[PDB]
């Protein structure tokens, strides 16, 4: 009855225009499950690799149709037959299968693909919600959302370095809350930029990428929709940043070069000089939260930074860790940032993203569950970021349905729960003193 | 000169080499826990001096016999004789000969024979062994075994003949390696060892035996025959006296390719260099597997037998027998279901 | 077959993979035809409609056969391939060969 029956992938697009393939897990007794893969990278030393048809002719080499056949003529061949609720074991029979470290024979979008349908199938089968089945009778904790609202650097043509900027509204008092106010001071911004005659058109995630004059212009515009909206900035609502520092960083002058994006009146800096204007801007403003702050091969300065200003201020790694076992227990070892950015098509199938969560959770690291470019209508991640009570989310702005649905399926998460459902917050930042 | 080897080939399951011929139904009789094939020349000599010819003329030019007139022990039973000795011989009833009962309807209408030379005495020619060793030293030679095996330069892919040079050619040095391996025949080995196993398939896919109607003669286990392989040049004496470790090797390769994607309890075990002699052992024992894979498939597709994957096994049934190797006992197949890998042997070749 | 019956799952595995939904269809020398020609060679009894089609296949490696049941003189359920069966199987035949040059 809980018997794999049937294992089925189709060809889909994903929210930017570009292929991305879905799996289908039907079991003997009926149950039913659909898994949509994220668009992610065929490129990566030590990260799971994509497959990609490579036909200029079809969707400008994007095509997905070789990672389809791989799951309907290998893949499901061997699957057909498990049980459904033998996640673990499918897994390693899909990464035995594949044979590869980076998972490139298959593909990690195949076998991220069947790994979310055989997941959902089984809480079908069980009758059970999601979250339910993949983090047992314990999952209660509502992750405080970092919303993304302003970006700049390769998403905006604007004098801004840093990639993005986002709000925490980490002073609510339940998530439903958390989602109003961000989605008031969403709309604040977007009366602010309309009254300063700037561009309201959003990009992936959902947010604005305005011509501001630079960084603290775009921050100062952050905290007037803040005030605007009617919340304290530093009580309520919070400011993260994802520097994304490896795009402007010469790799050969071991020089962060912010001339890339903020024209030739920036300054050049090293990583002492880097430390010192990330800790200058975490004293100007209310940011709990930076991503990227170094190059993802720039250790030491990634160390120095952990020990300057890791004790206030969450760090993310995204380029520094990759959702990567191995360099997130080297990262730990050498006390090189407080927390990791949780990718799960950058890893391949949810095994492994448990596993890395795990550990980061018993680093005393927080894990921050994370969207991709190019999303779905699926929305796992949500399932999985209550699943592990990670207390952490990252899946966009308030303003496309790739972002809203993952939202949406925390508000549902949330009213399922009913009384038990907690909002933390701050206290959901326990990698931070006190 | 001539380097001259003798292969000593001791057969770990039954063997079939056929001529075409089979026994009908109304060539032998079943009884007293034994076949009897009687001599038709015989049989008929004395049934004329016991006037029954007419109707035993009625009883094998008959055309469409319905379920017991297609029995020669309903004709002995009918016409009341109780002479059974028109030369011929007996196969010992194995038990494991046939599915449902050797009486009733269906049972055995055919049995395929052994080749047998002028005396009516079986042995195995030289030719077979010939081709076996041949398959063995060109599957396991990275000049031979190759892309050129193929001539796609057709309608359909073939084997490249002319890749292993023959024959005369004008105004050029003989270069003929095969005539030079000259694989004598075996002496006839007498009657006695001999069975009537049927065929097996049994398939990855559905993990189960399915019987077929192919019911052939072959060698008994456990038996010892003698080759002499003549050897004139030093490169066919170079890969004679490498059939071993080259017999390993094709194993090796037959078995990380085939075998190995079923359950260890039907693969035999070996005891000396593994072969695979006569029909019924499958067609990647025959061919150049590597090159094959693919075609060989492919030639099956669009018939109602379609070859899925890479086929069934072949899984004859034949008595257990197990062999006092000065080591311990080693049984010679490791199920309960007494299911020998059909067209196995094993040889040790020395250079007497 | 009366001692093994069609697995559910292999059933169930069949019924939604939709493999009788991709019949083929062989004349009476067991060469594929297409439906239209099958038809033709039923109709004028050139070809036997019963064991004239297959029904594509299952993937997945699935058992296609579980054991069949019936009921005791007890009222008991057993399955169909068990019980007194037999009794011959002597014990082996021990062949000597102690000569043998076994191969490493
Ligand atoms: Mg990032």
């Avoid at chain 1, 199938?121 to 405080?144: C, Q, R």
């Avoid at chain 1, 949330?414 to 990698?431: C, M």
């Avoid at chain 2, 006695?192 to 097996?200: F, H, N, P």
């Avoid at chain 2, 010892?224 to 004496?237: C, Y």
Wanted: glycine share 8%.
């Amino acid at each position: 009855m809980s018997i794999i029956t049937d294992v089925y992938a189709r060809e889909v697009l994903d929210s930017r225009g570009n292929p991305t393939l879905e799996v289908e897990v039907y079991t003997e007794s009926g149950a039913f499950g659909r898994g949509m893969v994220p668009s992610g990278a065929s490129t990566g030393e030590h990260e799971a690799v994509e497959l990609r048809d490579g036909d200029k002719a079809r969707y400008g080499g994007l095509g997905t149709q070789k990672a389809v056949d791989n799951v309907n003529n290998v893949i499901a061949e061997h699957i057909i037959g498990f049980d459904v609720r033998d996640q673990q074991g499918i897994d390693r029979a899909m990464i035995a299968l594949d044979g590869t470290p980076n998972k490139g024979k298959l593909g990690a979008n195949a076998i991220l693909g069947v790994s979310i349908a055989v997941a959902r199938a089984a809480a079908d089968y069980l009758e059970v919600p999601l979250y339910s089945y993949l983090g047992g009778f314990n999952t209660k904790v509502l992750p405080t959302p970092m919303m993304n609202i302003i970006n700049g650097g390769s998403h905006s043509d604007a004098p801004i370095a840093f990639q993005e900027f986002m709000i925490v509204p980490a002073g609510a008092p339940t998530f439903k809350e958390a989602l109003r106010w961000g989605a008031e001071i969403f709309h604040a911004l977007k009366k602010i930029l309309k009254e300063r005659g700037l561009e309201t058109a959003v990009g992936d995630e959902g947010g604005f990428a305005p011509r501001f004059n630079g960084t603290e212009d775009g921050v100062e515009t952050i905290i007037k929709a803040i005030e605007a909206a009617g919340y304290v900035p530093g009580k309520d609502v919070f400011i993260g940043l994802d520097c994304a520092s490896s795009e402007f960083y010469d790799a050969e002058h071991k020089v962060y070069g912010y001339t890339k994006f903020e024209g030739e009146g920036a300054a050049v800096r090293t990583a002492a000089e880097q430390i010192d204007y990330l800790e200058e801007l975490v004293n100007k403003y209310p940011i709990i939260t930076i991503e990227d702050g170094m190059d993802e091969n720039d250790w030491d300065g990634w160390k120095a930074l952990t020990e300057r200003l890791g004790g206030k201020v969450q760090l993310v790694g995204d380029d520094f860790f990759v959702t990567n076992t191995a360099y997130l227990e080297k990262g730990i070892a050498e006390h090189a940032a407080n927390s990791i950015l949780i990718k799960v098509n950058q890893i391949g199938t949810l095994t492994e993203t448990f596993d890395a969560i795990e550990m980061a959770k018993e680093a005393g690291y927080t894990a921050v569950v994370s969207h991709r470019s190019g999303e779905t209508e699926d929305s796992t991640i949500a399932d999985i970021a209550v699943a592990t009570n990670a207390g952490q989310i990252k899946t966009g702005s308030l303003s496309r349905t790739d972002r809203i649905a993952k939202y949406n399926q925390l508000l549902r998460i949330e009213d399922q729960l009913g009384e038990v459902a907690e909002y933390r917050g701050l206290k959901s930042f326990y990698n931070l003193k006190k | 000169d001539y380097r001259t080897f003798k292969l000593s080939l001791l057969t770990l399951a039954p063997i079939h080499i056929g001529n075409g011929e089979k026994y009908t139904s109304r060539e032998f009789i079943y009884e007293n826990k034994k076949f009897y094939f009687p001599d038709m020349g015989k049989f008929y000599n004395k049934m004329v001096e016991k006037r029954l010819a007419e109707k035993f003329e009625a009883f094998l030019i008959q055309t469409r016999p319905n379920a017991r007139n297609n029995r020669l022990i309903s004709f002995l039973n009918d016409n009341r004789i109780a002479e059974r000795s028109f030369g011929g011989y007996s196969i010992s009833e194995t038990g494991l000969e046939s599915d449902r009962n050797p009486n009733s309807a269906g049972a055995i209408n055919e049995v395929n024979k052994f080749i047998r030379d002028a005396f009516g005495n079986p042995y195995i020619p030289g030719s077979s062994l010939k081709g076996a060793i041949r398959t063995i030293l060109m599957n396991t030679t990275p000049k031979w075994n190759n892309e050129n095996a193929v001539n796609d330069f057709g309608r359909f892919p073939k084997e490249n003949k002319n890749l292993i040079p023959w024959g005369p050619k004008k105004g050029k040095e003989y270069d003929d390696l095969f005539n030079a391996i000259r694989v004598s025949d075996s002496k006839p080995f007498d009657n006695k060892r001999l069975i009537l196993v049927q065929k097996w398939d049994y398939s990855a896919k559905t993990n189960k035996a399915k019987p077929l109607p192919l019911y052939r003669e072959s060698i008994s286990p456990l038996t010892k025959i003698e080759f002499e392989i003549t050897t004139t040049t030093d490169e066919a004496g170079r890969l004679i006296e490498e059939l071993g470790k080259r017999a390993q090797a094709f194993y090796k390769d037959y078995k990380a390719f085939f075998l190995s994607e079923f359950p260890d309890d039907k693969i035999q075990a070996n005891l000396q260099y593994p072969i695979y002699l006569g029909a019924g052992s499958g067609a990647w024992t025959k061919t150049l597997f590597k090159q094959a894979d693919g075609i060989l498939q492919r030639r099956y597709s669009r018939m109602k037998t379609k070859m899925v994957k890479k086929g069934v096994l072949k899984l004859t049934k034949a008595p257990l027998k197990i062999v006092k190797i000065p080591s311990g006992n080693h049984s010679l197949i490791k199920n309960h279901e007494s299911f020998y890998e059909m067209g196995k042997a094993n040889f040790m070749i020395k250079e007497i | 077959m009366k001692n093994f019956k069609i697995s559910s799952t292999y059933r169930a595995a069949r019924k939604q993979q939709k493999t009788a939904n991709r019949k083929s269809f062989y004349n009476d020398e067991g060469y594929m035809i297409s439906p239209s020609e099958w038809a033709d060679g039923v109709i004028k009894g050139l070809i036997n409609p019963k064991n004239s089609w297959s029904n594509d296949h299952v993937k997945g490696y699935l058992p296609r056969v579980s054991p069949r049941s019936h009921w005791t003189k007890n009222g008991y359920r057993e399955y169909l391939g068990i019980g007194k069966s037999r009794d011959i199987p002597e014990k082996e035949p021990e062949v000597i060969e102690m000569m043998d040059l076994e191969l490493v």
